[PDB]
Structure 1
Amino acid sequence: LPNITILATGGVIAGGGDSATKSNYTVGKVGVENLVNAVPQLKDIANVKGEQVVNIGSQDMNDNVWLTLAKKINTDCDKTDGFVITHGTDTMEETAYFLDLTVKCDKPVVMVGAMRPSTSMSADGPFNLYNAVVTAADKASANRGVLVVMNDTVLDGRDVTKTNTTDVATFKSVNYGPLGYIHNGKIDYQRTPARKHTSDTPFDVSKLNELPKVGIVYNYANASDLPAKALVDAGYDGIVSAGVGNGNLYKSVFDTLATAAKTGTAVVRSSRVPTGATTQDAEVDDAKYGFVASGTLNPQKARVLLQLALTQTKDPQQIQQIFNQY
């Protein structure tokens, strides 16, 4: 049986409710040892070691936990066969992409959460955890990047996103599809991400104790420039715009971000729109403004990459090249 390390960070998967039918849930309550012990069936498919990293709702996920996770995986890569990270659902997709860029182990790293607490009727956590371990244990999962396993589906950490606020089936790779489906404890992989991940990225956070400051501003009708201005005022390294349509900006936001990019703030145009690329060669001449188009990376994903791009370079052409290959 393979050696699988479970790194817990919290989430509803480690929470509870006051009855089997209540909809109000706690987060990060149950310790990794108890969490692992609640699914004895894991012992059929791996030798599990549990470690508590933090115990929080993933809505409070942050740079400190990200750095911690990457360093821990990178250090311990040698001495296990794969990793599962238990995490809240809310920002699962951000952490998975951050690890997909900073983990240098080629061994399977699989993220998993639950939409219902283990106390609820038909709770999804036990089987999710089982399937996540199945995936971490499978030789075929190596070299595919950081994965998220939810609803019997293996999803790449780049494209995966939370598409519905409550559905157990919420996690989908909405532009390029999943890698594999899980049936009877086995996976038929038919796809792997072509974008460079893990050991083929330049991003090395091993010696870093902070990341560049990158915030996100939303666009909509009559959008205030005040949020963009506050980020600039605070010397943020980067700003990601959640634009309208194909990465467009409301005039007053556009004006502030244009000014910030001429003084050296990195500006990435992403989109509030849930599928499809923010392209070049549409309404915004990115070269002219010193902006970067995010491609299929949604705003929170664009943030991840831009923060890491900023550990390498402050140059808009070099950042756009990063956004074309990772």
Structure 2
Amino acid sequence: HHHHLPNITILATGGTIAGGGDSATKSNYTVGKVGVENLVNAVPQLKDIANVKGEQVVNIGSQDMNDNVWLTLAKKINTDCDKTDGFVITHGTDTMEETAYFLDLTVKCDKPVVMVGAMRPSTSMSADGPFNLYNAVVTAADKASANRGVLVVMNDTVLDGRDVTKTNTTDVATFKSVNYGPLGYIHNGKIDYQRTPARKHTSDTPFDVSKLNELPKVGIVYNYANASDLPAKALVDAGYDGIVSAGVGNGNLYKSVFDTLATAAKTGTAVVRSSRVPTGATTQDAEVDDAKYGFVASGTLNPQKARVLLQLALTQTKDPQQIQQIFNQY
């Protein structure tokens, strides 16, 4: 008997992991500049753990991530599932938490899908990207990683795609699953998993994007003192399918915003209450009678995460109570 290593496919999309600047010790850089081959060759130990094939899907900053790249990724992974043993997606950190949840809801492939990025560009002193990439490959190669949904691997930690969020603007340790914690930690190329997400993911969801050319239009409005209703009116005037509110506190709304959203809701615009507050649920049965206004409470989904689920909910139903049930199950 001979040892054979798993086959792992790297789908590259850009990010600071592929960023470069002209100095190792200045901060300035350009994103999504370096190709997948360069990233792979910067981690010569990858041969110890996997047979790696790299594909460049796009090369962008994830600040410019969009619905089309999401559809491209989901369809590619679902199509290519039988060709490989696992996937790593290199991506910008800014919207990784959004792409990861989208994929968590739409990947039907039963093989690990692991997202990874870097907070320092590839050119920087002590760049984090090479070890992050190694650890993402370790996770994608570990049989125990299966059936846990779509994962994010950053800073030696395996995080579920639903709860994971970027907590700090600059810190290499930025990614945390702030409400329910990580799934496992990586030490010396091994993972000790102690958790798995309960919410339904991947092959257990009804969302099937195989034939979609686009996704429903869902925007986000922010609340604060003296908030303008103009953003909300703009989305309503454009015929948006859904609006997510980044509420204050427990999903609360400035009154003018509340008035515009209540009206939209009774015309069939889906309205989800989420929170600008970085941890905790936007609950039912607090200060807003959701049943009365036809609103949906986001639970622990932050506004950008709630957008992901709402867009997908709107491919199935426009009924607020059915949308609320979706927000209680996925």
Cα-to-partner distance string for 1:274-310 (whole Å, 9 max, x where unaligned): 0000000000010100000000000000000000000
Structure 1 unmatched ranges of 5 or more: none
Mapped partners of 1:25, 1:309: distance in 2: 38
How many angstroms does 1:32 deviate by? 1.1
Cα-to-partner distance string for 1:91-134 (whole Å, 9 max, x where unaligned): 00000000000000121000000000121111100000000000
User: Is the 2:106–2:208 contact (alpha carbons within 8 Å) kept by the matching residues of 1?
Assistant: yes
Mapped partners of 1:89, 1:24: distance in 2: 16
What fraction of aligned residue pairs are identical, expressed as a percent? 100
Mapped partners of 1:115, 1:35: distance in 2: 14
TM-score normalised by length of structure 1: 0.99
Mapped partners of 1:94, 1:43: distance in 2: 30
1:57 corresponds to 2:61? yes
Aligned CA-pair RMSD: 0.5
Mapped partners of 1:106, 1:214: distance in 2: 29
Cα-to-partner distance string for 1:219-248 (whole Å, 9 max, x where unaligned): 000000000000000000000000000000
1:9 corresponds to 2:29? no
Mapped partners of 1:2, 1:40: distance in 2: 16
Mapped partners of 2:35, 2:124: distance in 1: 18
Name the SS of the counterpart of 2:132 in structure 1.
Answer: helix
How many angstroms does 1:33 deviate by? 1.7
TM-score normalised by length of structure 2: 0.98
How many angstroms does 1:193 deviate by? 0.1
User: Is the 2:113–2:140 contact (alpha carbons within 8 Å) kept by the matching residues of 1?
Assistant: yes
User: Is the 2:102–2:309 contact (alpha carbons within 8 Å) kept by the matching residues of 1?
Assistant: yes
How many angstroms does 1:66 deviate by? 0.2
How many angstroms does 1:24 deviate by? 1.1
User: Is the 2:19–2:121 contact (alpha carbons within 8 Å) kept by the matching residues of 1?
Assistant: yes
Mapped partners of 2:268, 2:207: distance in 1: 21
User: Is the 2:39–2:130 contact (alpha carbons within 8 Å) kept by the matching residues of 1?
Assistant: no
Name the SS of the counterpart of 1:182 in structure 2.
Answer: strand
Q: Where has structure 1 moved over 6 Å in runs of 4 or more?
A: none
Cα-to-partner distance string for 1:253-289 (whole Å, 9 max, x where unaligned): 0000000000000000000000000000000010100
Name the SS of the counterpart of 1:51 in structure 2.
Answer: strand
Name the SS of the counterpart of 2:45 in structure 1.
Answer: helix
Name the SS of the counterpart of 1:258 in structure 2.
Answer: helix
Mapped partners of 2:83, 2:21: distance in 1: 36
Map of 2:262 onto structure 1: 258
Mapped partners of 1:144, 1:234: distance in 2: 38
Name the SS of the counterpart of 1:181 in structure 2.
Answer: strand
User: Is the 2:274–2:299 contact (alpha carbons within 8 Å) kept by the matching residues of 1?
Assistant: yes
